Amino acid sequence: TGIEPKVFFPPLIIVGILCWLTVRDLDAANVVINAVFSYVTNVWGWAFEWYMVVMLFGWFWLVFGPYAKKRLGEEPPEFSTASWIFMMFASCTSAAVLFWGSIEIYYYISTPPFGLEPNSTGAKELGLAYSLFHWGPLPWATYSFLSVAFAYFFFVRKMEVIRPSSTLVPLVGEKHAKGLFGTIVDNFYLVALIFAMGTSLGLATPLVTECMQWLFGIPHTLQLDAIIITCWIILNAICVACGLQKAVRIASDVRSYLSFLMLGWVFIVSGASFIMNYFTDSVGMLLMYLPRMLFYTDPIAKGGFPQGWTVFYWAWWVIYAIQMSIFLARISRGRTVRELCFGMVLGLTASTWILWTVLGSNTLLLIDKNILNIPNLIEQYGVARAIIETWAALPLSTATMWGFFILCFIATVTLVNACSYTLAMSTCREVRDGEDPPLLVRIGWSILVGIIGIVLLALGGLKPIQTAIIAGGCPLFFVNIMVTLSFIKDAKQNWK
Amino acid sequence: TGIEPKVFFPPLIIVGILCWLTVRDLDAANVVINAVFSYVTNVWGWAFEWYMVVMLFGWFWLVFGPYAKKRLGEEPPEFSTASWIFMMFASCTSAAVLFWGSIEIYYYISTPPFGLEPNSTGAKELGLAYSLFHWGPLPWATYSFLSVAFAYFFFVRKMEVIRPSSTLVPLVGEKHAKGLFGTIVDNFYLVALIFAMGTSLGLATPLVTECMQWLFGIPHTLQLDAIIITCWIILNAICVACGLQKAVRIASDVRSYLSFLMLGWVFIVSGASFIMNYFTDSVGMLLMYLPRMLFYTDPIAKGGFPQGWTVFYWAWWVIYAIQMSIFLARISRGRTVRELCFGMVLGLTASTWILWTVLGSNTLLLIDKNILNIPNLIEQYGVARAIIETWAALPLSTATMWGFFILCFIATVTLVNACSYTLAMSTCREVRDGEDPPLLVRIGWSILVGIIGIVLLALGGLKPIQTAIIAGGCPLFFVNIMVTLSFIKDAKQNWK
Amino acid sequence: TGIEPKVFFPPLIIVGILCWLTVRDLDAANVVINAVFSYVTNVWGWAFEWYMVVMLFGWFWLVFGPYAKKRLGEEPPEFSTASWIFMMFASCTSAAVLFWGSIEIYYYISTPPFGLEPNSTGAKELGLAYSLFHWGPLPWATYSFLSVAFAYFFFVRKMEVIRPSSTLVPLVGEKHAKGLFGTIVDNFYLVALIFAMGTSLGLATPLVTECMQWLFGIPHTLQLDAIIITCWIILNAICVACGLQKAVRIASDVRSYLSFLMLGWVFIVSGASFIMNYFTDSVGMLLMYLPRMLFYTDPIAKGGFPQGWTVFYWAWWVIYAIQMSIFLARISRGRTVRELCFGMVLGLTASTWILWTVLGSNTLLLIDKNILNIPNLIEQYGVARAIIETWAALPLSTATMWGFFILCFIATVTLVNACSYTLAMSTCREVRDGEDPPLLVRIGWSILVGIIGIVLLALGGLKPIQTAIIAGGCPLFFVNIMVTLSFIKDAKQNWK
Numbered sequence A, B, C: 001t002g003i004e005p006k007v008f009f010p011p012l013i014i015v016g017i018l019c020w021l022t023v024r025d026l027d028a029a030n031v032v033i034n035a036v037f038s039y040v041t042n043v044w045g046w047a048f049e050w051y052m053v054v055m056l057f058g059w060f061w062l063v064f065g066p067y068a069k070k071r072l073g074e075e076p077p078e079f080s081t082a083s084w085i086f087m088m089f090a091s092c093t094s095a096a097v098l099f100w101g102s103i104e105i106y107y108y109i110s111t112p113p114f115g116l117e118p119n120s121t122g123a124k125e126l127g128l129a130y131s132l133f134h135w136g137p138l139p140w141a142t143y144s145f146l147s148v149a150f151a152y153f154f155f156v157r158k159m160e161v162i163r164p165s166s167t168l169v170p171l172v173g174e175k176h177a178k179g180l181f182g183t184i185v186d187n188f189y190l191v192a193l194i195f196a197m198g199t200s201l202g203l204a205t206p207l208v209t210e211c212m213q214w215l216f217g218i219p220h221t222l223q224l225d226a227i228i229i230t231c232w233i234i235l236n237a238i239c240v241a242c243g244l245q246k247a248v249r250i251a252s253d254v255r256s257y258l259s260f261l262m263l264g265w266v267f268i269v270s271g272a273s274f275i276m277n278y279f280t281d282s283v284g285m286l287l288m289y290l291p292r293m294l295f296y297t298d299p300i301a302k303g304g305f306p307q308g309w310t311v312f313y314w315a316w317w318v319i320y321a322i323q324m325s326i327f328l329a330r331i332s333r334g335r336t337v338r339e340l341c342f343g344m345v346l347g348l349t350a351s352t353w354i355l356w357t358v359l360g361s362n363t364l365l366l367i368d369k370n371i372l373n374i375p376n377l378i379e380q381y382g383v384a385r386a387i388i389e390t391w392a393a394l395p396l397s398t399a400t401m402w403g404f405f406i407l408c409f410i411a412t413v414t415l416v417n418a419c420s421y422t423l424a425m426s427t428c429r430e431v432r433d434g435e436d437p438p439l440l441v442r443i444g445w446s447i448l449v450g451i452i453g454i455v456l457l458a459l460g461g462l463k464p465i466q467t468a469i470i471a472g473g474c475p476l477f478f479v480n481i482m483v484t485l486s487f488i489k490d491a492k493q494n495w496k
């Protein structure tokens, strides 16, 4: 069970150097950060939207295409169509998603798009529609093209696939893919992916620690955000070093149910009728503004909206793009290309749309109640403090806050455990899929990830987080397109 | 020729009790009325829109579906494709439609949607588009699914169908349909339908009596609106008690022609060029605002627009839904599922679109002329007074007003004659279709209907009218869905 | 090589009389002009939009229709699919297009549509989108129906076609088409076409002479605009009287390359990033406003926008409609109906969109720089003066202005040479296609065309130009429809 170096070291080095250089000087890093962010987005952000817009076109090409009816492997599907869907529905709930779900509608209102007056009933009607855009069917649809390529590689070519290059053979020649070309590709990929995993952890953390501080009293400090990234890593090490994963799967489920439960709670207490009317009104907005939004760059007013939200989000999506499609691919053996397009979108969107319309209309009602001053809270304490204030403003606050705490807790564990497996896996040679990798390489990464998060938690602000991501997405833009093209050259000749 | 009691009495009783309870105390009723209206619409109005939205989706499923090419019975179609269409075109003209057609554009402008400044060129450009939405293809389309089910029941299953339950066997078992389940269903149905029939009569009446007052001088009073509901009933009794229906069909035609004639008059005098430019400009609005409107609930501004117009309409549509689909079904034997979807929509919309856009641009021009003060007219006299003032503001006023008067007149007769047949019919056992029912049961209902109308004419305002309807639509929401589902279970196994 | 009189004289006479009557009194003509313009557009302009809307529908009927896969002649296509496309791409660049491309975005901002505040960031974001509408795929698409009819006449019926009537046989009987019916048709056609050709020349001219004045110093006067219309005609006469056309084709190419070159220049110097972001943002606008715009008549605010821009442009399109479709038809032998629809649109739009988004974002940036006062320039000197100021505001102004000068120059030559051939051609009997017509009839027309242009250059303003066109478009409305219907009757029976 080797530790291939061409895919182990370049990551580790690069993450360390940059992570180090950043800890050295925070003030200066932040200046660099803000330089990068603004460049990429203001100069290039349009290419991101066009990416998503193409991928969308081709969800259609898949659905009304020639490979439309093609079956994804001969065998029958090893899941009940309902089990399958629920499996998608249940993947979507991350720690970090609770973060955005809870706050993003606020900024949508605070500083709106399309030159809208803030906190205007108008920027409010439009608030949730923008959620439904950024986490709607429209974005999920883009995944279907790679979800089908990985599906087809997996079963129609019975290919073994661990890293991005291992699919590239047809596009570039077994020569270059086995070579360094594929090694650079697998490295850029990994590095980008690492940052993402970290920034995700960085969102998760303050939610967990602000919760503790709320229930307990323990000041949310940095020496405490890092305390808990180590617990996570320790706790991780223990679970994996004990082959305890059997029970980790059982906790993951406890997580899914808790989150439906919670979402369900926030729904009924906050006022379904409203939520329904608001969700409805919102769908028509989405439907009518969709095209405007798909391509929004606000080039005259130069308000940052598209760049800071869409272009930031689109790019996060471009990163996690492969990790999911691979997952959508496995849970989906033996279905038809079209079966899958219609399924993943219907499924996932159900999940995403519920969340963001529940939490958002909660935190929106809170806004029209003046229960809490969200802006003054963010100002003096930081985003997460506010987020928790919007959960705690709820009836039976203490219990409600226990649910969230646990939820965020067991969720982040899941997350960590997950990043480590996948990371260790793409960095070890001669390892069968479904097999547990070397404990040292595994827990090893979990520390490097947890290290990234604090460095971002340290740098302070969201600008680090989003630069991290926007940067990440830049290589993956072409990685993704590459895999996609690869999948195409190799089905033009074999599928038929 | 029996009088089945399970479908005769529960109606009669319930209509009487409620009608009685309402006459007892008007002030208090109106308080109840306004309570119901606001509850249903503000809490539930969204589910109505979703209803229509689904049914729409499924006009597509019909058109690009599997039953797409299926023929609706083996025999050829007993109508010229042009006769057919004209038959649809000719059905749309009711008394009450003249009412809405004439006034509704005013309120759109007076109090507009989307936070628009009133009487702003802007709320004006959008005025007619909102007509074209509310009576466009989009709403007709929804009927196609039930129009096909009744078509299929009628011919592909050679089933005999008089009341909603008689279709339900497949969904619920011959047991329950024959039973009381189907009896409750047929009762809610009827009761709802009665109220509608009445409120329609309540719209018609003041148009007829305000016309009289204009031509003659006879004060439009309540003791006079009721005089005329009795004439209608008397006149009805005579026509039916004489088997005179042969000539009623001839008068119905005189009606259709008179209304094309009128519409045509108003068109050319008022200024075609404009009407064309306006109609055009309006179509694009409709086309671009369509999605916004489909789902509009105005949940932040809480202006009543969607709830008071759309939700009120939509629900009227859900009531008359079955009565028409059955009619579209019969006039349409031997056509293809798709032949019918494309036809009814094309046909009907032609009819509806012309009307509104004519009467509305008339009454719109009147508005930009300050010929008359519509608002002050409504204030001191009631809506209908204004409506008539917009007809009489026309050239050759007196003749013009004769045309309308007659039109409204012979039209309402038609209406009454119609409600009575249908009502008596769904309330008598062992009666073949196409056959004249018992004169007592027939004329009997015509009095109960005419009774409802005055009670509403009595209660004063539109709020009674729209509550009536919005209430009606509530059961029929599920009745309609039920029939629809029934039609589906039973084609999944028999059509093939 | 005869000079058929039925198609030579009525033109010549009519153009002369009207041209004469206009020179007699300019002040009065202009009063007539402005009378016509406002009548046609305000009363009828809607019918133009409807025209374009139908033809669009039927690009779909072609694409998803029955003639979808039909091949346009048996033989294979005598062009490389890339040669083909480039041939379309290369046709679009006229002199007159440089004019509109350069200025039109200004007025879109100066006086905007949809009740927009002028020079508002808002009327600006929407500026270019309106370009993308007026010269987008949407307008090209309308040509495909006639492009296919001429294609089919040419190869599927091996018919010989010189004038509009020669296609009409099936619609009207060889009797009437050979007759005068077809002679009136061919006359209205021609006359309309002449004016267009002229007004095009009238746009070209002041661009050429304002360039001279910029590089040289020679005052742009009227006695100079006419100097150069005679040079063009002289220069024309020489080239054609020498059978020199071999080298004219070579100069035409030099033109295409120069214009790509120029467009490319303006692109990179002005700031691609922006241009990209702006082009993007603009596509979404187009996509979302599309329906509103398709049918815009602004009937309440009665701002002239639709009538003065769309209805004017639409009508220009209705004239050149046949001349192009015939050309698209020839360059396209042996392709499939659908091959063509997808091809012409993709092709042409590529061309048009690039132009107008480059020149317009240049002239837009100039606006937000206050480099030049475009309004005050138009006021004291006339449109063209401004246009040139926006080219000359560019880096390396003098060379830049040489490129444009040459471009406009060799372009207008091409134009003139072209109008003369075609005109002489449709006015001479017994002349094979591909054959050079009589030098007297040829150069003869070039003087009559150049005469029209000055008469317009004389009358001053754009109102003459656009009335010219709008008037032209009126017969061609039905000519076009006629050809189209003819093509239909004759494929219903022969293609199969």
Ligand SMILES: C[N+](C)(C)CCCC(=O)O
Pocket: A107, A303, A304, A305, A306, A307, A308, A309, A462
């Ligand atoms: C700062 N942040 C990320 C909370 C919102 C930024 C919105 C924008 O880019 O204009």
Ligand SMILES: C[N+](C)(C)CCCC(=O)O
Pocket: A092, A096, A316, A317, A320, A324
């Ligand atoms: C980037 N993120 C986490 C907001 C969404 C990534 C897509 C996914 O969750 O599968």
Ligand SMILES: C[N+](C)(C)CCCC(=O)O
Pocket: B107, B303, B304, B305, B306, B307, B308, B309, B462, B463
């Ligand atoms: C008053 N009425 C019923 C005629 C119009 C109501 C408009 C609304 O729903 O707010």
Ligand SMILES: C[N+](C)(C)CCCC(=O)O
Pocket: B092, B094, B096, B097, B316, B317, B320, B324
């Ligand atoms: C309810 N109403 C009258 C507005 C439309 C009912 C449909 C129909 O008349 O067939």
Ligand SMILES: C[N+](C)(C)CCCC(=O)O
Pocket: C107, C303, C304, C305, C307, C308, C309, C462, C463
């Ligand atoms: C005058 N012109 C042609 C430059 C712009 C006219 C715009 C309009 O018709 O309102």
Ligand SMILES: C[N+](C)(C)CCCC(=O)O
Pocket: C092, C096, C097, C316, C317, C320, C324
């Ligand atoms: C009207 N015009 C000349 C600007 C466009 C004519 C269509 C074409 O370029 O073929």
